Design a protein around this ligand. Structure first.
Ligand SMILES: *[C@@H]1O[C@H](CO)[C@@H](O[C@@H]2O[C@H](CO)[C@@H](O[C@@H]3O[C@H](CO)[C@@H](O)[C@H](O)[C@@H]3O)[C@H](O)[C@H]2NC(C)=O)[C@H](O)[C@H]1NC(C)=O
Lengths: 48, 49
């Protein structure tokens, strides 16, 4: 929930669409690379 | 994979062909197939676009 005050109204600015099979989940084969800019990884459920 | 839940975890195969039996007959609408009636209208004995 958007924790705000008792009289606050939330409005969106940029709405982005994406396909069904999508999640910000890196493949578990990102243990180490040569760029030293490894993002955090997490296992995503099947179907994406 | 349709959903994100496990209904049953038994009797799962590996691979197959599963060729869809596409019909050789094209969509024929000359008899009225694929059309519906206009909402709250009759249009008795006439042709309309
Ligand atoms: C809405 O859908 C999600 C996704 O299907 C449901 O989350 C799933 O809930 C089931 C049942 O609690 C989880 O199964 C359990 O997993 C634990 C390990 O975390 C395992 O020890 C148990 O034996 C059981 O198998 C499943 O993991 C979980 N999946 C995810 C991705 O969170 C959720 O419960 C559904 N909510 C409602 C209200 O139906």
């Amino acid at each position: 929930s958007f924790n705000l005050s008792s009289y606050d109204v939330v409005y969106s600015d940029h709405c982005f669409s994406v396909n069904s099979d999508f999640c910000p989940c890196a493949d578990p084969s990102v243990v180490n690379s040569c760029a030293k800019s490894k993002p955090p990884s997490a296992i995503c459920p099947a179907g994406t | 994979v349709i959903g994100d839940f496990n209904c049953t975890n038994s009797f799962i195969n590996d691979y197959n062909k599963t060729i869809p039996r596409i019909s050789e007959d094209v969509v024929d609408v000359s008899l009225g197939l694929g059309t519906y009636y206009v909402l709250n209208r009759v249009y008795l004995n006439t042709t309309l676009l």
